[PDB]
Write a protein that binds this ligand. Structure first.
Ligand SMILES: *[C@@H]1O[C@H](CO)[C@@H](O[C@@H]2O[C@H](CO)[C@@H](O)[C@H](O)[C@H]2NC(C)=O)[C@H](O)[C@H]1NC(C)=O
Ligand code: NAG
Ligand code: NAG
Ligand code: NAG
Ligand code: NAG
Length: 249
């Protein structure tokens, strides 16, 4: 039941100083700590995607590289998770992250993914996301991380068997979607996945119209790519990363 419904246009914007995360689970207070890790570089070129379904395949699969910075200004219900893998078919393993109103399901199986995968609400059905899922080796259900104008930031890394997800929710006063300043991303989950990830894709939710089988919709999200970079992070009195300098400039 794979159907091509999403067309996507893309523009390019500046990351400013977004994308800093806590590199470890160690409390540091009132110090300057220099760490070398996969960070999103300051003032880097970040791709802004507008995905439109109006009521052919024009929604290609993005590369993953060394890790992905994801951002969205959209509401919590439109973007509902992500797809990670290499071939995205039944011959290789894949990771599916699906959020809904009550919880989040993170599940690694052998999914036969559709060319334009989307979660459709009517209750929610995943029959348009994939046609089959066999030999499934990981499942993890927990409290959701897309909850409620509001900028939502995620960092995905795939390092030595662990899929690390970092997140942050920042209330941005109505204006430019990518704001100035710092908002460090707290460690959200470390998943013992152990799979090869070279490509990734965003999952959107589409509503049936009941009036053009699906309601017309748009979703805007920012994707940037992490690079091995040395950062100097400032930890303040309460342990929060309030500032950083990227050592290339
Ligand atoms: C949101 O996702 C959760 C996780 O899958 C759903 O809860 C499960 O629903 C199935 C019914 O197909 C039950 O068999 C499971 O026992 C439920 N698990 C848990 C942990 O509750 C939930 O139904 C989904 N909600 C919506 C609106 O789609
Ligand atoms: C971002 O990349 C595009 C294409 O690679 C390029 O045209 C544009 O100038 C870049 N923007 C910046 C700020 O480097
Ligand atoms: C994968 O699934 C197929 C059929 O679903 C089965 O024949 C095969 O043995 C499975 N392989 C593993 C490693 O589970
Ligand atoms: C990961 O997948 C890519 C693309 O299919 C492949 O070139 C690479 O060798 C794979 N790496 C491992 C460790 O399987
Ligand atoms: C840290 O926590 C204290 C405790 O009340 C608070 O007064 C202060 O505003 C917080 N922030 C900083 C930057 O010290």
């Amino acid at each position: 039941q794979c159907v091509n419904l999403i067309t996507r246009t893309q523009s390019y914007t500046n990351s400013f100083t977004r994308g800093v995360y806590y590199p470890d689970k160690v409390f540091r207070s009132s110090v300057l700590h220099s760490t070398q890790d996969l960070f999103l570089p300051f003032f880097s070129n970040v791709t802004w995607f507008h995905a439109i379904h109006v009521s052919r395949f024009d929604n290609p699969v993005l590369p993953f590289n060394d890790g992905v910075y994801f951002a969205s200004t959209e509401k919590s219900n439109i973007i509902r998770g992500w797809i990670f893998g290499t071939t995205l078919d039944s011959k290789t393993q894949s990771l599916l992250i699906v959020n809904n109103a009550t919880n989040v399901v993170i599940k690694v199986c052998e999914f036969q993914f559709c060319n334009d995968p989307f979660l459709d609400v009517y209750m929610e059905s995943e029959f348009r996301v994939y046609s089959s899922a066999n030999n499934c080796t990981f499942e993890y259900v927990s409290q959701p991380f897309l909850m409620d104008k509001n900028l939502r930031e995620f960092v995905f890394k795939n390092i030595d068997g662990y899929f690390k997800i970092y997140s942050k929710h920042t209330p941005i006063n109505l204006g430019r979607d990518l704001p100035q300043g710092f908002s460090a991303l707290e460690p959200l989950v470390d998943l013992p996945i152990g799979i090869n990830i070279t490509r990734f894709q965003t999952l959107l939710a589409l509503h049936r119209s009941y009036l053009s089988g699906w309601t017309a919709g748009a979703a805007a999200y920012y994707v940037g790519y992490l690079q091995p970079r040395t950062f100097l992070l400032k930890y303040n009195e309460n342990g929060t990363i309030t500032d950083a300098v990227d050592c290339a400039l």
